Structures are given as structure tokens and as C-alpha cells.
Design a protein around this nucleic acid. Sequence first.
RNA 1: UUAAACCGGCGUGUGGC
DNA 2: TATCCGCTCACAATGCCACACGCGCTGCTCGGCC
DNA 3: CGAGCAGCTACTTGTGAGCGGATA
Lengths: 50, 48, 98, 112, 417, 417
Amino acid sequence: TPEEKLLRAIFGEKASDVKDSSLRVPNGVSGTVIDVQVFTRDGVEKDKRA
Amino acid sequence: PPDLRPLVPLDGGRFATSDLNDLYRRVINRNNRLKRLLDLAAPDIIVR
Amino acid sequence: RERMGHIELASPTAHIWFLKSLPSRIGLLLDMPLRDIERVLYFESYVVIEGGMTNLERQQILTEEQYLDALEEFGDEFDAKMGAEAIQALLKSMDLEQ
Amino acid sequence: KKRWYVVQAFSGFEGRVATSLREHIKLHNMEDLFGEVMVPTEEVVEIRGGQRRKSERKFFPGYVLVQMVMNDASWHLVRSVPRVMGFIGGTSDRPAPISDKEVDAIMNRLQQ
Amino acid sequence: MNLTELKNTPVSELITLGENMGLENLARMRKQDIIFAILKQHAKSGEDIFGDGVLEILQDGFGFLRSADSSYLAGPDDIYVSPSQIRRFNLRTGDTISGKIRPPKEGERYFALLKVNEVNFDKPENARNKILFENLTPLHANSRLRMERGNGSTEDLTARVLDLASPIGRGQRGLIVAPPKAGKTMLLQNIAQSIAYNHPDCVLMVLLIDERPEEVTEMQRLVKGEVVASTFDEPASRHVQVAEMVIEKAKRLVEHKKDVIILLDSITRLARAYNTVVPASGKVLTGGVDANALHRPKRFFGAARNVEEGGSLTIIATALIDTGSKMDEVIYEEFKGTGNMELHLSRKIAEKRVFPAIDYNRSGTRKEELLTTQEELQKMWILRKIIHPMGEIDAMEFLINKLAMTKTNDDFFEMMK
Amino acid sequence: MNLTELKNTPVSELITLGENMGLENLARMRKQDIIFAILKQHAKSGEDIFGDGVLEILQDGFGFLRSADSSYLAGPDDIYVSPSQIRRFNLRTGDTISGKIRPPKEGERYFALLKVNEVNFDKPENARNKILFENLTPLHANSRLRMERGNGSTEDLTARVLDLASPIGRGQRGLIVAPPKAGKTMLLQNIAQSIAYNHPDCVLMVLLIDERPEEVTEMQRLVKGEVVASTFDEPASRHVQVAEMVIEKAKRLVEHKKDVIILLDSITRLARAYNTVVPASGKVLTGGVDANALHRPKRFFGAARNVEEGGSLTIIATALIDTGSKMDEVIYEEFKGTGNMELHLSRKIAEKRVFPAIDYNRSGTRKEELLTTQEELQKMWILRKIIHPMGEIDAMEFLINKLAMTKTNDDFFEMMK
RNA sequence: UUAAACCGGCGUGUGGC
DNA sequence: TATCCGCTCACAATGCCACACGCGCTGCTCGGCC
DNA sequence: CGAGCAGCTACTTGTGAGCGGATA
Ligand SMILES: Nc1ncnc2c1ncn2[C@@H]1O[C@H](COP(=O)(O)OP(=O)(O)O)[C@@H](O)[C@H]1O
Ligand code: BEF
Ligand SMILES: [Mg+2]
């Protein structure tokens, strides 16, 4: 409904974002991160870490 | 049944599919074309 | 998983498992070798049914020129279906006890 | 007599297959033995209304049955152009075309 | 038979007719669902049903025959129209089509129209060979549509005042700018009644968008003609659906050389729905309206025009002000410059229980000389000259008193003497 | 053959011509779609079609030949122009090109122009070796363009008053500042008619942006010359398209040493469209206008100039006031300082049915001594001296009475004696 | 109607035994 | 008109385990019953 | 308008049986 759209717009850019959709380490393997690699598509805004 | 030949969500236009689905697709397409050809009084060699 | 559907085909079709099993089941049932049935099912040849007063045998196969030249001798009483329909008609009118 | 022989081809480019067949006719000035293409893919919807105008101007099986009085050199011509998947017809490879009643039928399909 | 022939009557006659047809309990399902079941049984009796409706074209190419009494909306009795008819005749949106229909076989959806028998109350041959609507030549209002009733009612003045403020004619584009609680409802009511009584030749098509259902019921069974409406019960999708459908029906009826009056209230809610159903262009305007949110409203508004060849389309869409926010006012602005006919109503005088409170000052008509005779135009010019130098309350009380002291408008001219 | 040759005539002759061509039912499709189908069949007859149109350049490098009768907009008969012509001759936007065209093969889009035969009514050799428009030397109005008709009509005064208020000449930049319901329509109408009748040498190019379609039809078939317009039926995109296209056509025609009069109404709606189609700079001005929203309007306005070498471009763009909001007034302000020719119209006198109500006080022309002879300039100075010390109503009634009591302007001078 | 609790299909290549 | 001789095709080829990767682009035509 | 079709190998070897076939 228009109220939902105007509400999610006035509260920033938020929706049914509850999707975890995050990568974790596979169950059983430890380690220490030593290098991060990120590559963006032309046009997408680069985050500060990139 | 569809559970035996699944279409799991592979991202993008690329899709992880079963093999039988393409055969069923082709068979249904040919069957629909044959059903629509007989009504249009199509040539005998064409329906053959 | 247990519930399934079906496909209504406008034209009959022959099952390949009884065609090229070596030996076949339809070829032995019709007393006809596999090559003639193969030529019939793929529309390079015909097969006649309900011979009767004609000079031709029923279980024989015909080609395109054979169906052309043999059409003028008998028009109404002569029946020559082509494809899986002809095979189905042969199977329907085939007795077993005799 | 220039009969109307039916032929199947590499589909998808069927119109371009017809144009290439025509180019091959006009190359060897084969219009003596040959006629035209008769690709009556002419279901002619033009519902150019609001929110959508892309109408399907083409609907017919991928057959481009050509009028010609057949010769074996003509057969090897129509097979020499690429995209000729099947020259159908009951035969070894020298078929008999469709009758004239289906010529009237295809005239109906063209007019519609 | 015809669906509307079963629709003019309440659910009670439909129930007893279904009992005559020998079916399941009809009162349980909806009355339009009752009509669907009844037509299904009537088709089961071995007869071809005769249906009618205006055409709605989807992306697939087929059509739906929406009925008049169903407010031009989706229903179980919407006749399916195969694409072959759109290939033969190419019936566009809004074409009133009547013809033979068959029942839906199982796994199908609705009734299918076999052969058209009537195209827009004319032979089907005129449907293919015809000049289109956006292809016409728009013109100004040549013929004048008088508004006064002629027997001197109290709200008859509400028509006379228009004929005294700014005339209305065929093909005009009228706006009604009024705040809430001003008197627009009764105004358009008596306007429709006067158009129907004094000018029964033209096709009265009253329109209602997002109002009370009681208002819809009061409008449908009070005025002459078809009354299609879409209240708040339907979202912006069905709002824009019914709007474009009635506008295309009017386009087709003008193509058939007929006059169509479209009294719409309100245009601001229609604009809100349009702004709701437009894709975002990554930017907003002043008030909270998208950039391309006005294109389709402007199209719907400018569909009205006067034609050289035949027929006219005159829309009177009410504009709403005093809503507190900007966007609605923005709409109003974007609509003062496109319409060639303004009419402004007063709420500051309506709160004084002074009706009807029409703004005589900012009312006007472009090319109004074609809307009235010569000497009547001179007398109206002199009358506006008299009305101008006095105050607002002065002009309005003078209007109401001296027009209720009169009965008709030419009698008013002959009394001012 | 030529598209305009099939366009000057209505859809009826197009229908019978298509019936002569033996095609599908033509009346069903649009009349411009009829022309597309008809030209397709004419090309099927084995002949090279001869087309013409003004060039529109996209980002890809090819061009479109937009036709005059199609209001310089997108159409199915827009001739495709291969980039090779832009490589050989480098035809810029607005260049009227006529040449041989071929039908579109399937999977193509439109007709393709093979070889140019006429470039701006001149040989193609002048197209490559030519001095450009923004490369010219702008000057003031040297030659005077008289406005009075000469037979003494009632609206002939509406021209005379200009010649009595502030002269108009070639290469000038004119503004018409007027509120709504003031008399701008008939004013520009008789202005165009007088320019055409008294000065048929110059190219009359009347322009209309976002008005009623009836107004467009009244303008097209009343005045001499090409009438391209874009009503509210088209969004800001097509508005800016037609605007830049007519301005580039005028630029090219002045490059070819010809005089172009551009009567535009209104400039405020054009500025609104421009402000609608500019990228947001994260800030807004007073009234609700973007920062860079004025650059392209200012370019379009200053395109008018008088040239040393040949030709002139004189634009008369009407400014709109009394709109209630600020932004429009802002436009007006940003436009008083760029134009060197102001003309102000009165609505406070127009409501009194006193026409024509031109503001004689705030009207004026910069370097007006080059616009009129010596002693006529002395007499105009003395006449403005007489007009000044009396009131507004006094000056205006004196104007209208004593000029309707006259027939021509020099006769008016000889009667004031 | 209400309350509580819970919610790798295919091919390919390589290597090893 | 029966009996070997040779042509032609189907069917099969250890089992596990571990790791890794790649399963495409664009134009046309057909399907139409939310 | 969406979806599906489509256009841009040659050393495996054995074992076995079914089907001409040719030759008296
Ligand atoms: N020169 C004139 N003579 C007579 N009437 C005029 C004249 N100029 C304007 N009018 C009146 O003005 C009205 C049209 O106004 P319009 O041109 O639309 O105003 P604007 O264009 O400034 O909004 C007509 O009804 C006409 O009676
Ligand atoms: F009302 Be006018 F056309 F500005
Ligand atoms: Mg105007």
C-alpha cells in the first residue's frame, strides 16, 4: 500500500531485510583471515573497505 | 512428479535443472503444434 | 511425489521398448520383421488393412508409389492407415484364440 | 508443372533461409525451374493499444514450401544452400509434393 | 440471455430464476456469482447466449467484455474474446460489443464470444473502416448545451448560475475547483439531471471515483444513463482501470459521432492513484509527486475535445483544494493550464449556509462567444460588469436572492430589463 | 513521393489512395500509420521515393528526418539517415534535407535516405563550406518590420499599437509578459497574420507549446507558414525535443541568410519542462527551480540574434505571470534581463472588456532608434510624452478610442496633426 | 474463534587406495 | 526351400574416497483461457 | 509480453543374438 512504501522510504531504505543471506565459515574449519578481496561492478558504489 | 525432477534456485538466468524437463518441454511443444495444425487444415505432408 | 499427471496426445505413438528390444514384441506379434515396421512408423511406407475383395494381402506394407498406384483399384473398401493408428488398428482386429 | 514441394530447414532464421534460397535461385537464374517461397507466417495482429504494441506479425510452421518442377539438380540446389535440415516427403530422397487442395488451403492461410 | 437484463433487477429475482433453473442454493454465493451460475445453466439448456460488454485488452491480445452494471471491473461474467476477433475487426478498448457466447468448458475460465452481432450500436462493417479518435481534428465548443431546467426549482438555480456564470457546451473541458464541504455532490447531481431532462439527445455518462458506497447508490438510481463508479473499495489499479475504460468507451462513442458527457469527481484522487501506479524515476517533485506521474493523467484529461466530423467529448472533472498539503494543489495547478474551462466553487461562503457558492469572479470560458448568441453575450458582458465592482458577499447574495426571485434565465434577463 | 504531399490532405484521400494501392483496411490504423503503409507499397512498386525532413541527431551518430506536419516528433515515416552522410556533409540539427529514400527491409525500422538532393533549399556544396550560427556576429535590429495591416480592421489596431508602443524588427528578442485571461492568443494570431500579409518575404514560424488541441488546430489552418506545436499530450521530453528542433531549424535557416520569426507561447511552460528534465544538484532555488535548470532555457532564448552576414532570428516568447507561485515569476525575472525587447499586457484592464490592453508604460525597446526613421521617432517620443502624465485607464481608453477612430498609423500621425 | 510449544542433478579434470 | 556364413546392432565394462571447475548470447517465432 | 528454439569421429573389444544371404 502507498503507506507502506512512503513509510519504508521515510525510514531510509528498509524492507523485509531479515534475510540472513550471509556467508560463514564451513562447519569444522578454523582459520585466520589474512587478506580480503572485493570487486565491484562498473557503476556500483565502492564501499570504504574497497 | 516434479519432486523427482526439481528446478532448484540457481541465481541468474542460469538454472540448475534436470535432464527430463527439456524433453517434456519439447514433447509438449510438438503436441501443441500438432493439435493446432490439424485444426488449420494443414497440408498432409506437414502433419505427417 | 505420488500424485502425477498425464499428457493427452492427439496422435498415437509406439513404445520403443517393444520395438527395438532385439527380439521385439510387436514384430513377433505381427509376424513382421522390424525393418517394415520401422519404415511404416516413420511414414516412408504404409500398411494396409481390411483387404477383402482386393488382390493385396493385409499384413503387407506399401510405399508412397505403392499407395499411389493401388489407390485406383479399390477406393471405398480399401483401408490404408499410416502411422501408429494403423498399428493400433492391426492390434485391435487381431484375434488370439484362432 | 511447377509443383509446390514442402521442405523443412534450420529453424529460427527461416525467413533468412528463404531469402538465401531466393539468392541461390537468382544466382544460377533458376527461375525457369523454380517459383517463390510462400512463407505465409501472416497472422497479422496489430493491437497497438496502451501499455503494449509489440504484436506477433508472424505465425506459421517453419516450412517454406517452394513452387518448382523438381529435378535432381534442383534438389541438390535446394540442398546446396545451408539451413535445409529436412527436405521432407515420402521417398528415399525424391518426394511427391502436397496436392492442389492444400494449395487452396495455403491461399486461405495467406488471405485469412 | 443478456447479463444486464438479469442485472437491472435485485438478487431476489435472480434467486427465484435460479430456483427455476434447478441449481444449488443461490443466495449463498454472490449475486454476480448467482448470475454466472444462472448463465451457465442457461447455456446448459442447449442455447447460445447473447452477451454484451465493453472491451478490455490485456498484453496477451485477447479481450474481456466488462459489463456496465459491474462498474467495468473484473467479474465471473466477463466474456472472453478470442484474439481472432481482434485480428478480423481489431476492436479497440471501450468498443461496446454484443454477440453470441458459449459456456466455459471445464478447465476454462469464462464465456467465449463466438461471433459479434453489434459493434457500438452499429453494423460491424463500420468498425474496420472508421476514422480514429486521436486521429480526429479537435475544435472548440460550437453548439451550446443549456443547463436550466425550466420549472424553477431551488437547485434549478444551480444550473442557471452556470448559464449565467460561464456557458457549457459539447467538446468542452471543464474543471470544478472546490474545497471539501462545499456542495459539489448536489451540484453535479442537478447538473446531470438537467442535462438529461433538457438535452436527452446526448449520452449522459456520470463518473464517480473513490467516494462513499452510499453516494454511489444515490447516484446510480437518481440520474438518467449509465453510472459506473469505483469507490475506495478498489485500489489504484482498479481505479486506473475503470478510468481508462470509461475514457476509451467515450473515445469510441465519439468515433461513432456521438456526444459524451463525463462528470468526474474527483480528479485529484485519480491523480493520487496515478502517482501511486507510476515507476519511480529516482526523483520527486514539489509536494511529493513523481516526474512522469502527470503524463497519463494529462492524457486522460485531454482526451476530451470537440470534433469536426462528428460527436463530442465534454468532461467536467472536479478539482479539490484546501487539503493542507502541496501535492494536490500541484495537481490543480498542472490542471488549470490544460483545461479550457474553469469553474470555481466557494467554501468560505458555503460555511455561511449560502448555497450555491460559485466563484463568479474566477469562473470563465475560453472562446465563450461560440457558446452563446450575440445579444445574450452582450447582456452577459454587462451583467458581469455589474457583478464585478461589488464585494464577494455582495455579488453572491445578489445572485442567490435575485435568481430565486426569478424562475428561468431569460425571464431573469427580462426582469433585469 | 513526398510525405507532406500526402499530409496536406485529410485521412480520406489517404484511404482511397491506399485502396488504389491494394492493401489491408487503412482506416483502422492511424492516418500517419496509413502514410507509412502507403509509402511502403509505393516503394514496393519498384521506384525510389523522394522524402524530406529536418534532421535530428541521436547519440549513436545517425539521424532522423522528422516531418513538418508531424510536429517534428517521432513517427513511422521518420527517414533514417546513415552516419555516412554526417561524415560527408555533416548535416547538423534542423537542416531541411530532401533526397532519395528506400523502403525498410524486414527487421529494419524505417526508410533510409540514400543520397541527398536538396540541402536547406540550396545545393549540397554550400552545406559543407558554410559559416556556423554560434559562430556569427550578433547585432541589433537594423531593418524595421512594420506590423499594421493597412485596411483598418478592429484587431488591426492590435498590430498598430505595437508600432505605436515599441517597434519590432529582424533579429530582435521579444517578451510578452501577460497574466492568464488577457488576450495573448488573438494577439499573436493577428501578429502572425500581419507579418505574413504585409511582409511575405520573411519566413513565418509560429510556435505553440502545451496548449489546447483546438487551439493548435485553430492556429495551423489560419496563418501563413509552418505551424509545429506540442500540446500537453506530450511530456517534457517531447516538449524540449520540438523546442530544440525548431530552434536548430531556425539556426540553420539564418545560417543560410534567411529571416525567421518564432512566435512562442508560452516560455514559462517551456521553463517548467526544462526544470523537469534537469539533473538534481542537491539544492533548490527560490520558488522551486534547480540551479542549472536555467542554462538551457537561456541558451534557447538567446539563440535569437541579428547577423552581419545574412538572415535574422527574431523570437517573441510570451511570459506568464499571476500564477500564484514564485517559480514562474522567477523565470520571468531571469528573462527580463536577457531579452532586449519587452512588451507587457494588462489583465486588470482586460477584465473590463477593454481590448487590447497593452502596458504602454513598461513596454519599450533597446536601441529603438534603429527601428524607426528620424521624424517618426521624434513624433513617437512626443506621443509617449503625452501618454505619460495621464492615468493608466486614461492612456488606455485614449489609445483604443482614438486608434479605432483612425484606420492606419501614419493616418493617425496626420490626424493628431 | 482464543491461548501455549516446535519447525549434489550432470559432466569434466586431477589425485589416492 | 533348408543350412550354415557373414553383416549389423545392443550391452557391458571394480568399488570407494578426496579435491577442483563450469551448466552461454541474442534474435525470431509461437504461445494465446487472468 | 514471455518463453523456447536456434544459429552463430574416425584404435575398444568381446560376447552375444537377430537378420539377410547365398548356395546347393
Ligand atoms: N483584441 C481583442 N478584441 C476583442 N476581444 C479580445 C481581444 N483580445 C482578447 N479578447 C478577448 O479575450 C478572450 C480570449 O482571451 P485569451 O487570448 O485566451 O487570453 P490569454 O491568451 O492572455 O489567456 C476572448 O474571449 C476575447 O473576447
Ligand atoms: F490563460 Be492564458 F492562455 F495564459
Ligand atoms: Mg492564450
